[PDB]
């Protein structure tokens, strides 16, 4: 009924959908730290970047590659600022919290 290319494409799309929801939900579900939350946000960005690159190949179009570069730039900038804020908050509140970087406890 369907070919090997159709299996490959549907497998890619199913994988990226589960990747997106894993990055959105999982670290919050497992009650993890802000550092792991930022890592999972990077997983969300990776899923969107893979989707854009797949579509850019699928349509023979340039816009997915432009979006890929932009996503990498924005994600790294936001992650760096978030980690700096995490370090500052940890040094401000560790004298009375111990588990200061975990707000899901």
Q: Is 95 in the site for other proteins (CB under 8 A)?
A: no
Under the binding rule (CB under 8 A), the answer on residue 8 touching other proteins is yes
Minimum separation from the CB atom of position 46 to other proteins (A): 6
- Kindly identify the residues of this chain, within the stretch 60-89, that bind other proteins according to CB under 8 A: 60-74, 76-89
State the nearest-atom distance from the C-beta of 97 to other proteins, in Å.
10
Please state the closest distance from residue 85 (CB atom) to other proteins, in A.
5
DSSP-derived secondary structure for the chain: ---HHHHHHHHHHHHHHHHHHHHHHHHHHTT--HHHHHHHHHHHHHHHHHHHHHHHHHHT-SHHHHHHHHHHHHHHHHHHHHHHHHHHHHHHHHHHHSSTT----
Q: According to CB under 8 A, which residues from 15 to 54 bind other proteins?
A: 15-54
């Amino acid at each position: 009924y369907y070919t090997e290319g159709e299996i490959f494409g549907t497998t890619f799309m199913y994988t990226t959908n589960m990747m997106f929801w894993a990055g959105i939900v999982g670290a919050v579900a497992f009650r993890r730290n802000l550092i792991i939350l930022l890592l999972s946000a990077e997983t969300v960005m990776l899923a969107c970047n893979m989707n854009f690159l797949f579509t850019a190949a699928y349509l023979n179009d340039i816009t997915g590659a432009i979006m890929s570069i932009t996503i990498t730039t924005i994600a790294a900038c936001e992650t760096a600022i978030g980690l700096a804020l995490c370090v500052a908050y940890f040094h401000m509140r560790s004298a009375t919290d111990v588990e200061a970087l975990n707000m899901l406890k």
